[PDB]
Amino acid sequence: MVQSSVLGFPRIGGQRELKKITEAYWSGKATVEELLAKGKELREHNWKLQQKAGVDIIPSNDFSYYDQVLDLSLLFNAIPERYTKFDLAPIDVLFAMGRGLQAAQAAVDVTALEMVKWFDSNYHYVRPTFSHSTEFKLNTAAGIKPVDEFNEAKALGVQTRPVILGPVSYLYLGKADKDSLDLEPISLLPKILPVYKELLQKLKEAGAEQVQIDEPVLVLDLPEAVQSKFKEAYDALVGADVPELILTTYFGDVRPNLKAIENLPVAGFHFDFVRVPEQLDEVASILKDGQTLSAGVVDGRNIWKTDFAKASAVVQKAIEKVGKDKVVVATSSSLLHTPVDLESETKLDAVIKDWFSFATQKLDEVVVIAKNVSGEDVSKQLEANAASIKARSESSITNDPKVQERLTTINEALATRKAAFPERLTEQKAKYNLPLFPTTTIGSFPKDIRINRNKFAKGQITAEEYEAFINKEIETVVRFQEEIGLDVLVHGEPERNDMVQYFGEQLNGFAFTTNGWVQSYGSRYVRPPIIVGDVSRPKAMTVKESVYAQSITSKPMKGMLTGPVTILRWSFPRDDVSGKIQALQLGLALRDEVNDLEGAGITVIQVDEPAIREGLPLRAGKERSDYLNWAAQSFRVATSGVENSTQIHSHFCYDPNHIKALDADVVSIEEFSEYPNHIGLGLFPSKQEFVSRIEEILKPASKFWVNPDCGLRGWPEVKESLTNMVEAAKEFR
Numbered sequence: 001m002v003q004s005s006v007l008g009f010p011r012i013g014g015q016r017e018l019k020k021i022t023e024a025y026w027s028g029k030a031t032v033e034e035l036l037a038k039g040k041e042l043r044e045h046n047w048k049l050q051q052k053a054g055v056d057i058i059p060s061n062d063f064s065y066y067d068q069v070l071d072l073s074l075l076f077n078a079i080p081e082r083y084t085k086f087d088l089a090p091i092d093v094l095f096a097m098g099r100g101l102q103a104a105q106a107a108v109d110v111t112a113l114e115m116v117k118w119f120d121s122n123y124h125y126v127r128p129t130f131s132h133s134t135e136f137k138l139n140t141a142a143g144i145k146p147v148d149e150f151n152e153a154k155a156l157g158v159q160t161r162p163v164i165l166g167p168v169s170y171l172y173l174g175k176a177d178k179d180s181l182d183l184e185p186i187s188l189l190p191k192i193l194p195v196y197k198e199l200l201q202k203l204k205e206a207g208a209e210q211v212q213i214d215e216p217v218l219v220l221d222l223p224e225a226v227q228s229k230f231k232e233a234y235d236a237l238v239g240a241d242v243p244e245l246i247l248t249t250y251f252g253d254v255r256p257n258l259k260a261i262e263n264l265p266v267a268g269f270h271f272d273f274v275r276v277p278e279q280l281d282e283v284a285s286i287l288k289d290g291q292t293l294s295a296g297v298v299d300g301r302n303i304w305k306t307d308f309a310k311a312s313a314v315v316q317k318a319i320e321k322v323g324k325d326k327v328v329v330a331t332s333s334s335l336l337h338t339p340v341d342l343e344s345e346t347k348l349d350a351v352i353k354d355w356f357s358f359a360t361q362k363l364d365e366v367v368v369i370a371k372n373v374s375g376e377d378v379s380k381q382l383e384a385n386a387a388s389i390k391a392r393s394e395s396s397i398t399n400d401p402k403v404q405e406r407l408t409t410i411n412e413a414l415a416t417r418k419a420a421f422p423e424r425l426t427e428q429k430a431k432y433n434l435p436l437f438p439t440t441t442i443g444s445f446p447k448d449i450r451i452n453r454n455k456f457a458k459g460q461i462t463a464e465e466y467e468a469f470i471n472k473e474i475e476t477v478v479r480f481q482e483e484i485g486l487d488v489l490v491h492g493e494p495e496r497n498d499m500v501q502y503f504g505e506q507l508n509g510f511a512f513t514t515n516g517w518v519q520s521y522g523s524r525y526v527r528p529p530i531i532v533g534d535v536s537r538p539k540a541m542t543v544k545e546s547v548y549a550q551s552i553t554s555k556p557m558k559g560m561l562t563g564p565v566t567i568l569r570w571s572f573p574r575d576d577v578s579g580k581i582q583a584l585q586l587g588l589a590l591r592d593e594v595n596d597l598e599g600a601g602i603t604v605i606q607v608d609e610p611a612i613r614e615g616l617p618l619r620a621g622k623e624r625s626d627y628l629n630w631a632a633q634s635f636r637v638a639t640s641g642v643e644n645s646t647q648i649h650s651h652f653c654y655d656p657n658h659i660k661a662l663d664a665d666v667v668s669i670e671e672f673s674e675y676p677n678h679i680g681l682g683l684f685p686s687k688q689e690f691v692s693r694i695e696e697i698l699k700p701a702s703k704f705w706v707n708p709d710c711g712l713r714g715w716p717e718v719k720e721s722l723t724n725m726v727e728a729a730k731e732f733r
């Protein structure tokens with residue numbers, strides 16, 4: 001009988017209980033005991049769910065109040081001193097590191113540690129931060145979270161497998177603090193290993209027989225000298241006095257690093273065969289006698305019902321290489337990255353809901369697959385699964401002939417402007433006559449809003465009253481900008497709740513959930529859109545508010561759009577067609593929008609792709625350069641239908657060559673000399689500080705726009721700043 005395994009379970013709660021209790025604790029409404037009681041109730045509920053589903057290997061220490069990497073930093077005393085001088089008990093040191101700390105000496109405003117994207121998932125972890133003076137050690141009176149949680153589950157009669165981030169990944173994903181700029185985190189390895197060993201011994205003494213030790217940096221391009229550290233670390237940790245170690249990898253391909261793990265004393269490995277099924281043969285063939293192979297075949301980052309027949313076949317290949325006794329059916333990664341429970345959806349059509357599985361359902365999928373490859377009769381589940389998979393692949397939701405046919409029209413001309421920039425600029429100058437050092441802003445501006453969204457969705461106020469409120473907000477914002485004297489304006493987007501869902505709602509091919517929440521960072525969660533089929537845009541999405549904003553001023557009003565790659569990356573994508581295809585479909589839908597904007601007189605249009613870098617494939621090579629090419633192609637498909645006098649803008653927070661590939665008229669960036677398309681380097685503060693910072697960037701005149709850093713912060717600050725920025729632009733004129 002082949003075992004089933006889950007690498008981690010989302011902890012937010014089916015009703016976002018974790019968010020509610022933590023935010024209550026932070027605002028003084030709940031006590032720390034109330035906090036802890038809710039956490040314990042969440043963990044117990046999630047363990048019992050997993051046991052009842054029949055999962056064999058059930059994780060502990062996957063729970064967190066904020067972030068699991070932060071939890072380890074607190075456990076190992078990677079705590080910078082500044083957080084320690086306020087008499088905070090350890091759980092409050094933890095929160096102080098995660099979210100910062102303010103006290104009424106002058107006031108304290110101690111900033112949080114940095115938030116970092118966890119690989120290419122949509123989760124963010126708190127950066128481990130080390131100094132030359134870091135003394136790594138266990139903190140017994142803080143409680144040892146993985147020991148305590150292991151024991152809690154055991155007392156419920158649930159044997160679990162503690163999960164911790166391994167020492168190489170933990171140090172390598174961390175960074176040197178300000179006061180220790182030359183420190184290489186990985187150099188700290190000999191100092192941290194004794195703390196890992198101690199932790200593992202305490203887990204063993206409590207009854208833990210296996211531990212999942214995550215080494216996800218093995219899917220990254222690692223220097224050779226980092227590669228050798230795996231043999232060192234794991235030779236030091238393995239022994240009679242510790243649990244068996246299952247070295248766990250996800251999100252990518254470990255083959256370039258196989259030599260690093262081919263002679264390890266660990267008890268087994270886990271690999272992600274959803275993202276990289278093709279590494280199976282080579283990773284299997286380095287397993288030593290006795291080592292087990294955990295085959296990650298149930299996607300931990302997407303919401304589609306698994307094809308039981310294909311997932312079992314992947315598992316059956318593993319079984320053929322190393323033996324039925326040495327394979328485990330697993331989720332590809334932690335279920336951290338999926339929503340909690342499909343059964344909470346109250347509005348989804350049953351046809352569509354038949355195609356999905358969220359975390360709770362994925363528990364049943366790993367069990368049924370495990371039974372299937374072990375020889376049990378599960379033909380009824382197999383048949384029902386095959387029926388769902390079949391229905392999806394034949395549905396019209398998925399296949400729209402017009403979109404298919406439109407994809408066949410994509411070619412170079414469709415992704416190229418009618419003329420090159422220099423010629424375009426001469427028509428743009430005749431049209432706008434913008435003065436040199438033109439001034440604009442990047443988008444957002446500074447209460448009552450949701451109040452009016454609300455009575456409108458319940459039909460209490462007409463579309464008529466709703467529109468006048470929107471238009472009054474737009475009005476305020478436009479007049480404010482005019483009185484400051486900005487040259488190119490924005491409307492403020494009071495009509496928009498969310499950069500991606502605002503578009504997804506208005507596009508075919510999308511479905512939406514009531515409860516599909518995923519933790520993004522801390523207590524902040526996202527409810528991503530789902531791409532279910534071929535995307536098209538039946539009609540104008542933004543034209544109305546932009547046309548109204550443009551009508552009350554003789555300054556150029558920017559249209560504002562989100563790009564195709566960002567819409568794709570902050571949605572749950574289809575798993576039946578490539579990312580590329582989904583991006584080009586989005587490019588084409590956005591092209592209709594850009595063209596309608598231009599048609600309605602909105603001939604300055606900003607299109608932002610803030611997710612481009614998060615989507616970078618994890619290793620260098622063909623997949624990465626293909627991604628950068630199609631990403632840019634998709635942007636150009638959206639923006640290349642316009643006349644020469646229409647001005648495409650794009651704004652970047654974050655590689656100059658990719659930016660160049662977009663051929664935008666104006667790029668706002670928050671030493672590429674021979675590049676004609678114009679740039680606004682972000683400046684935001686004195687008029688003279690402005691005067692200084694521009695003067696020094698001087699060291700090209702006709703090419704510089706002036707603008708802030710990213711969206712706007714209180715009215716007096718924005719005003720004073722914006723007004724100072726404009727004054728500075730005028731001197732130079």
Ligand SMILES: CN1c2c(nc(N)[nH]c2=O)NC[C@@H]1CNc1ccc(C(=O)N[C@@H](CCC(=O)O)C(=O)O)cc1
Pocket residue numbers: 122499500520523524525526527528570571
């Ligand atoms: C800009 N970001 C973003 C994204 N993904 C999506 N889909 N949308 C986004 O705006 N990924 C990267 C980053 C994530 N940052 C954030 C920041 C705040 C909240 C947030 O405030 N969430 C609210 C719920 C908002 C709502 O009502 O939907 C919360 O309090 O949990 C979420 C993600």
Ligand SMILES: [Zn+2]
Pocket residue numbers: 651652653670709710711
């Ligand atoms: Zn920005």
